[PDB]
Amino acid sequence: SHMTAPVVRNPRTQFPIFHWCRGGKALSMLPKFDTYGQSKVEINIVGSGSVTIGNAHDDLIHDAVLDYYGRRLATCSSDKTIKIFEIQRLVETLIGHEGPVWQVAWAHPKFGVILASCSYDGKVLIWKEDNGVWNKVAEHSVHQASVNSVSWAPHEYGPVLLCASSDGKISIVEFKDGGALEPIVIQGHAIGVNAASWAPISNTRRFVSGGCDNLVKIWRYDDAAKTFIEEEAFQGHSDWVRDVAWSPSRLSKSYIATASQDRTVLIWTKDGKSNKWEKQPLTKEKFPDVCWRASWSLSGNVLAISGGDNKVTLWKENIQGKWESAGEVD
Ligand SMILES: [Ca+2]
Ligand SMILES: [Ca+2]
Ligand SMILES: [Cl-]
Ligand SMILES: [Cl-]
Asked: Which chain positions lie within coiled-coil regions?
């Protein structure tokens, strides 16, 4: 051929995982290599007793999350599967996805022992444990692209899943009658959506999303419109927003953290008695590599960030409203 336009070649990676206590147990996963240059990816589960699950999958692990009673661990992988451990023994491998599984999320226990998974294959699958055995119970297949995140609503809203896709859309669907049958699907972000997370209960129902237009958006359920409408669109990031986290403190003042492949985290806040949002960078300097995941403690408003620095870094706001390092998880 005769090609005058520039042609480039481009390429996939393992990041750390951490979550705050469930059933008394915190979880961490810090990638390492040994002396033979072999990956050693150990999931540590630490209570007030520690258990280590080594090599849960042979391929990349994209998520690892305990259930709310800290009795089960779900891990998911580029190998297209989800593994369920009782915590240790491997109990089941959940087979159904046709591409990498990016995230899993546990439903509130009032609904049962239920896991949602999202995948490159464009599906959200819902799995349920009954009498110690796992079965696929529903499929939510409205996206025409990778589905990058899944999150269950506050249980007061019902068993409702929030899903973000590379097709630019966000879907919100209630699981009922062994199906996912009446979804709301909205155009969320240009190019793609990477994450969406629920606000804590207020009765206005909100969530926040981040995507490939470098924007963070806040959405509210409108009673008159009977759908979710865009309430805020926050500028600040200079590259794709990779994760968004709405702090579960629900006392007056709201906190949202947004993590970006621009190598920064922005903290957005709104005073209880204000309608105005304000932003502050988490850190004075860029992180060494992308910021991939963010999550807040249940109390104390401590922020955990995972990224290509290969660390889980912790952050705490000081008396003067500035963020300081609180160490890192080992
Ligand atoms: Ca797209
Ligand atoms: Ca999250
Ligand atoms: Cl979860
Ligand atoms: Cl969070």
From this structure: none
Residue 278 C-alpha to ligand 2 middle, in angstroms? 21
User: What are the tokens at 180?
Assistant: 């996912």
| Long-range contacts of 232-238, Cβ-Cβ distance < 8 Å, separation of 24 or more | 232/277, 234/258, 234/266, 234/268, 234/277, 234/279, 236/266, 236/279, 237/262, 237/264, 237/266, 238/214, 238/262
Find the 2 Cα to ligand 1 centroid distance in Å.
29
**Contact in structure between 223 and 256 (CB atoms under 8 Å):** no
H/E element, 38: none
How far, in Å, from the CA of 159 to the mean position of ligand 2?
17
User: From CA 154, how far away is CA 107, in angstroms rounded?
Assistant: 9
List the domain boundaries for the chain.
1-330
Q: Ligand 4 centroid vs 209 CA: distance in angstroms?
A: 13
Q: Which two tokens stand for residue 85?
A: 């451990």
Q: What is the CATH number of domain 1-330?
A: 2.130.10.10
What is the arrangement of strands in the sheet containing 50-54, beginning at the earlier edge strand? 17-22, 25-29, 42-46, 50-54
Distance from residue 44's CA to the centre of ligand 4 (Å): 20
